[PDB]
Design a protein around this ligand. Structure first.
Ligand SMILES: *[C@@H]1O[C@H](CO)[C@@H](O[C@@H]2O[C@H](CO)[C@@H](O)[C@H](O)[C@H]2NC(C)=O)[C@H](O)[C@H]1NC(C)=O
Ligand SMILES: *[C@@H]1O[C@H](CO)[C@@H](O)[C@H](O)[C@H]1NC(C)=O
Lengths: 38, 53
């Protein structure tokens, strides 16, 4: 058997679960880790 | 200024130090050397029987 549903105006909607960020600006930084065993 | 808002630059810490947390087993056999030292000095005393008599 088959299952049916008629789309009214030919427009369908997809889930698309990933977020959308819309960034503002990008920054740059520097840092030192200093691994020590003592 | 105009429509855009300006924010101050952020200062950054120069260095970081890593000190990870370690599990504590809490074993009890270590630091028990005193008991071994006590075992070393048993010092059983036996006096000859018949030398006096
Ligand atoms: C290394 O030894 C020290 C000293 O025995 C341990 O520090 C003790 O840890 C216990 C459990 O947290 C505390 O109740 C004591 O007060 C601590 N004593 C001191 C002097 O700090 C330490 O836990 C040990 N390290 C490991 C990884 O077992
Ligand atoms: C398809 O339709 C039948 C009845 O026509 C129904 O029993 C079945 O559950 C439907 N399947 C779906 C909705 O996936």
């Amino acid at each position: 058997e088959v299952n049916m549903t008629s789309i009214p105006q030919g427009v369908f909607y997809q889930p698309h679960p990933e977020p959308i960020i819309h960034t503002e600006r990008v920054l740059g930084l520097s840092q030192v880790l200093m691994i020590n065993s003592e | 200024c105009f429509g855009v808002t300006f924010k101050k630059p952020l200062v950054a810490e120069e260095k970081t130090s890593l000190e990870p947390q370690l599990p504590h087993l809490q074993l009890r056999l270590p630091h028990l050397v005193g008991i071994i030292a006590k075992i070393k000095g048993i010092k059983i005393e036996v006096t000859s029987s018949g030398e006096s008599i």
